[PDB]
């Protein structure tokens, strides 16, 4: 057991850092970083935040978090994995965001960037209003919005214009509306 009372920041142009086995009782800012980072077995009592110019690839493993936010003009690649808390997300940047292998995820917002939802047990709700550009695309893989308990459906909403592609995405069977170019990524030859 270890307890930390403060905030931890990855300074501008930093790289090669590695952390493990800490309970951080505060934010974790990531601005001006140059990638090549790796967090493991960590907890955060507040929202991770990323701003400014970012390049490279970042990894978080078993990093429980109250929420996550990404902004700025950075163009890095944030990779998430594991965790046992209903975290929120909100990406407004030209970065690339990846999430996979999670039992739950709280509210999700998609204003910009590239978001790839993969292998999520349950999603509380989803939203998207991005616009068409070479850095923007929304793709979902093997994740359902239907909570087994209390047997309800989370909302969905896409009013933006960015393209998208759904593969094995369980949602309200009821007729609805979606805006933006669609790709029939899946294949029907094999059912």
């Amino acid at each position: 057991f270890v307890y930390v009372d403060g905030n931890v920041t990855i300074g501008a142009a930093v790289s090669g850092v590695t952390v493990s086995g800490l309970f951080i009782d505060g934010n974790l800012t990531i601005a001006g970083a140059n990638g090549t980072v790796e967090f493991i077995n960590t907890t955060v009592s507040t929202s991770i935040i990323g701003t400014g110019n970012n390049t490279g690839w970042f990894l978080f493993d078993e990093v429980n978090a109250d929420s996550v936010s990404i902004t700025g003009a950075g163009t890095g690649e944030f990779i998430f994995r594991g965790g046992i808390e209903q975290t929120d997300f909100s990406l407004n940047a030209p970065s690339k965001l990846l999430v996979e292998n999670r039992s739950r995820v709280g509210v999700v917002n998609h204003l910009n960037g590239l978001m790839i939802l993969k292998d999520i047990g349950v999603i509380v709700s989803l939203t998207s209003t991005a616009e068409d550009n070479a850095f923007t695309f929304l793709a979902v893989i093997s994740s359902s919005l239907f909570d087994p308990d209390p047997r309800t459906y989370g909302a969905l909403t896409k009013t933006g214009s960015c393209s998208y592609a759904f593969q094995d995405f369980a949602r309200s069977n009821m007729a609805e509306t979606v805006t933006g170019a669609k790709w029939l990524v899946s294949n029907g030859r094999d059912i």
């Binding site: 068409d132 393209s163 933006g180 170019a181 669609k182 790709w183 029939l184």
Partner: protein, 149 residues
């Protein structure tokens, strides 16, 4: 400075909306009998207009075959919206004006696809990875591709 005017709305006079100007006359004499042809010079010239024309419902149909000194003559009707007729000996005429041929082009622009009929431009939406062609039955269909020039 930053700019977006220099994009497809660039300083040019607006796309490439240009048709060979109805320039001055060069030659007009009519001939019956066997096939006849004339020649002109490219010197100080960059375009011409040809209006080969039928007269008096003669057997010969209007046609245009153009060649230079070296290259062979090109076929114009081969890329035309030709219309035939259903000439019948039946006492109850059903000689319809069946559309012999129809041609259209599909080309790409960034994340947009457009098909053009005559001079009207038909927008088709955004990229999706696939195009679809639909036609009735009993016809023959061909599809090509090439550079945008």
């Amino acid at each position: 400075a930053l700019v977006s005017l220099s994009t497809l709305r660039g300083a040019l006079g607006g796309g490439s909306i240009s048709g060979i100007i109805p320039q001055e006359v060069l030659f007009d004499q009519w001939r019956a009998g066997g096939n006849w042809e004339v020649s002109q010079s490219t010197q100080n010239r960059t375009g011409f207009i040809v209006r080969s024309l039928k007269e008096g419902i003669g057997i010969t149909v209007s046609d245009l075959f153009v060649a230079t000194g070296n290259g062979g003559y090109q076929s114009i009707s081969q890329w035309e919206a030709t219309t035939f007729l259903y000439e019948t000996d039946a006492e109850g005429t059903s000689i319809d004006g069946g559309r012999q041929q129809a041609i259209a082009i599909v080309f790409k622009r960034g994340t947009q696809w457009y098909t053009k009929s005559g001079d009207v431009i038909l927008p088709l939406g955004s990229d999706d990875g696939v195009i679809r062609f639909r036609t009735p039955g009993y016809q023959r269909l061909t599809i090509w591709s090439g550079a945008q020039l």
